[PDB]
Amino acid sequence: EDDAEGHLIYHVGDWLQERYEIVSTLGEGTFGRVVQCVDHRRGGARVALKIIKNVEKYKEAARLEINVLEKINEKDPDNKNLCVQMFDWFDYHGHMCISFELLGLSTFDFLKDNNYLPYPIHQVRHMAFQLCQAVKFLHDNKLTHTDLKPENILFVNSDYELTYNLEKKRDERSVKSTAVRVVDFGSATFDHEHHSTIVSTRHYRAPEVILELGWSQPCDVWSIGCIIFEYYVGFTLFQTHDNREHLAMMERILGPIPSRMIRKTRKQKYFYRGRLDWDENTSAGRYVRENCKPLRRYLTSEAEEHHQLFDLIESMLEYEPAKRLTLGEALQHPFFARLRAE
Ligand SMILES: O=C(O)c1ccc2c(c1)nc(Nc1cccc(Cl)c1)c1ccncc12
């Protein structure tokens, strides 16, 4: 009973393994569909079931992800470290099905269903903290969630409040609680298993990955630095799909790539005479210089708390992966002082 592209054919009210009962669809992706379900063997707890196509490569992909979720569950027995919880998984007629705790909209969907209006800085703070907290729990267990984006950070609950802005004559949404979870472990890699060559989503991709210099945990921090910027202004920091433009935007926003990285990268067609081969006086050259600025010029306030957020973002968008801030040292960063510890 299969779709023309491999998906399960279901309707509201269908049952799965006479155990789950479909209520709604939450979304879809290339891999399959996520459905809201009631789980009558967990006393009617509401779950989110992921239904992946009959396609083998996805079936095998999910088996790897199921292993990562198994390990997360093994090393967070009290569900304190803010990665999504898998309650169950089963093979259903060639469809791999994973049972997750029910959460809300992503931090991206909310940001766009609010017209790409940034989150207020004190929300950026609790979101950034939880992000680092959860990705540090992975690093402390020899993992790299290879694919961090606002799409994969779910609000536990994205109920909000509407308020009218007298000042700016605008209807503003404000999510009530900022508890998040990190999701989508389909790409996470233990330290000891095989590493893909290219990982992450172009906009959140670290330069070491681009220059094929070898990657591990530090490349997540790069991602996190990009998501934080987006949380704070609404738009992605790097808006490209080409390597040389990408590498050129980084040089615009962060200054020149260090020579240690250049001389060592085998991607030498991007450089001439030790420097990035890029002519600012061209077609794409002045598209880059016009469409993004040095980092701290994106500051919307000289308040010291705002300078502390860009102090943070600057340390995660460091070129050299080992000069790059670690999540351990990030939970200790001055920017997170105003938070209440627990
Ligand atoms: O991959 C996971 O680990 C993963 C795990 C859980 C959820 C999820 C993705 N996506 C949700 N939303 C969503 C939104 C848009 C498209 C798609 Cl496919 C899904 C969702 C909602 C409520 N509860 C859990 C989830």
Residue numbers in the entry: 144 to 485
Paper quotes:
CLKs are dual-specificity kinases that are activated by autophosphorylating their own tyrosine residues and subsequently phosphorylate the serine/threonine residues of the SR protein. Later, CX-4945 was revealed to have a strong inhibitory activity on CLKs; IC50 values of 82.3 nM (CLK1), 3.8 nM (CLK2), and 90.0 nM (CLK3). In order to elucidate the selective inhibitory effect of CX-4945 on CLKs, we determined the structures of CLK1, CLK2, and CLK3 in complex with CX-4945. The overall structure of the CLK catalytic domain contained 12 β-strands and 10 α-helices that could be divided into the N-lobe and C-lobe, which are typical forms of the kinase.
Out of CLKs, CLK2 was most strongly inhibited by CX-4945 with 3.8 nM of IC50 in vitro, which is quite noteworthy in that most of CLK inhibitors are more potent on CLK1/CLK4 than CLK2. Moreover, its inhibitory potency on CLK2 was similar to or even higher than that on CK2 (14.7 nM of IC50). CLK2 had the longest N-terminus with an extra eight residues; in contrast, CLK1 had the shortest N-terminus. For the β-hairpin insertion structure, CLK2 had a complete conformation, whereas CLK1 showed a partially disordered loop. The interactions between CX-4945 and CLK2 were highly similar except for the carboxyl group of CX-4945. The carboxyl group also directly interacted with Lys193, and water-mediated interactions were observed only with Glu208 and not Asp327 because there was no water molecule between them. Intriguingly, the charge distribution pattern of CLK2 was the weakest compared with that of CLK1 and CLK3, indicating its preference to bind to the hydrophobic benzonaphthyridine ring of CX-4945. Therefore, based on the size and electrostatic charge distribution of the active site, the binding of CLK2 to CX-4945 could be stronger than the binding of the other two CLKs. Third, out of three CLKs, CLK2 has the weakest charge distribution, favoring its hydrophobic interactions with benzonaphthyridine ring. Together, these results support the relatively favorable binding of CX-4945 with CLK2 over CLK1 and CLK3, which is consistent with its stronger effect on CLK2 that were defined in the previous study.
